[PDB]
Amino acid sequence: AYYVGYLQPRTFLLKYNENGTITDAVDCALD
Amino acid sequence: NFNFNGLTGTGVLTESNKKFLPFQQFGRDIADTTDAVRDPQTLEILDIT
Amino acid sequence: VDCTMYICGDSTECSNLLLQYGSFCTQLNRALTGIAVEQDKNTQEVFAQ
Amino acid sequence: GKIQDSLSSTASALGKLQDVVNQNAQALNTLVKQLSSNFGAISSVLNDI
Amino acid sequence: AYTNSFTRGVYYPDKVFRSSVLH
Ligand SMILES: *[C@@H]1O[C@H](CO)[C@@H](O)[C@H](O)[C@H]1NC(C)=O
Ligand SMILES: *[C@@H]1O[C@H](CO)[C@@H](O)[C@H](O)[C@H]1NC(C)=O
Ligand SMILES: *[C@@H]1O[C@H](CO)[C@@H](O)[C@H](O)[C@H]1NC(C)=O
Structure with missing residues (x-):
């Protein structure tokens, strides 16, 4: 029971943490 | 006066407390300079100051 | 003053x-x-004192 | 005692100083972030050029 | 059929390390 979606151009904000791994982001054009 | 894969620059180098991801090469700062590289023939990671 | 449409005016490649x-x-x-x-x-701070 | 209470809980009252500190630390950051822009060049970093 | 793409459509966009910064 697989999924599928499509990527599209978005400006995103990426929060690198202490370890250097992404932990949360925000889709700049959502709301 | 270091050189890593063509990246020139000056400064001092030390061991890395920072853990590193096994696909990157470059630590870049807010200030758009390189603070962290890995030796391209040794998997040790160095800090650039 | 708006930034972008002063500089270009609703045009893509200028922006x-x-x-x-x-x-x-x-x-x-x-x-x-x-x-x-x-x-x-x-x-x-000048009237509603 | 009321002053001591109002200061011992809320930090909003320090806004006069706090905005100044923010105004400076923000100016530094934007200035430094301008090093990341190309200005009509082939690269925003000098040492590559 | 449809489901809600919550937040796990995200990845590292480049091979450049960063720490403790919102970029
Ligand atoms: C990040 O580093 C800290 C070291 O203080 C560690 O406790 C934490 O588990 C690390 N995070 C991950 C995801 O390994
Ligand atoms: C290249 O250097 C590495 C050192 O990490 C060594 O393991 C390898 O044998 C070398 N390859 C040569 C000399 O062809
Ligand atoms: C997907 O959302 C869009 C608009 O919100 C709609 O076209 C579609 O039918 C939704 N999913 C389902 C199960 O209807």
Whole structure:
């Protein structure tokens, strides 16, 4: 029971943490 | 006066407390300079100051 | 004052050459919005005492 | 005692100083972030050029 | 059929390390 979606151009904000791994982001054009 | 894969620059180098991801090469700062590289023939990671 | 449509005016490839100049007009808004609240802060501090 | 209470809980009252500190630390950051922009060049970093 | 793409459509966009910064 697989999924599928499509990527599209978005400006995103990426929060690198202490370890250097992404932990949360925000889709700049959502709301 | 270091050189890593063509990246020139000056400064001092030390061991890395920072853990590193096994696909990157470059630590870049807010200030758009390189603070962290890995030796391209040794998997040790160095800090650039 | 709006940044982008003053510089170009609702046109794409002119605006793409703007963003390669970094963040000029981003602080210009915060300059002008900064003075925008200031006379509101002035009018508040000059009558409703 | 009321002053001591109002200061011992709320930090909003320090806004006069706090906005100044923010205004400076923000100016530094935008200035430094301008090093990341190309200005009509082949690269925003000098040493590559 | 449809489901809600919550937040796990995200990845590292480049091979450049960063720490403790919102970029
Ligand atoms: C990040 O580093 C800290 C070291 O203080 C560690 O406790 C934490 O588990 C690390 N995070 C991950 C995801 O390994
Ligand atoms: C290249 O250098 C590495 C050192 O990490 C060594 O393991 C390898 O044998 C070398 N390859 C040569 C000399 O062809
Ligand atoms: C997907 O959302 C869109 C609009 O919100 C709609 O076209 C579609 O039918 C939704 N999913 C389902 C199960 O209807």
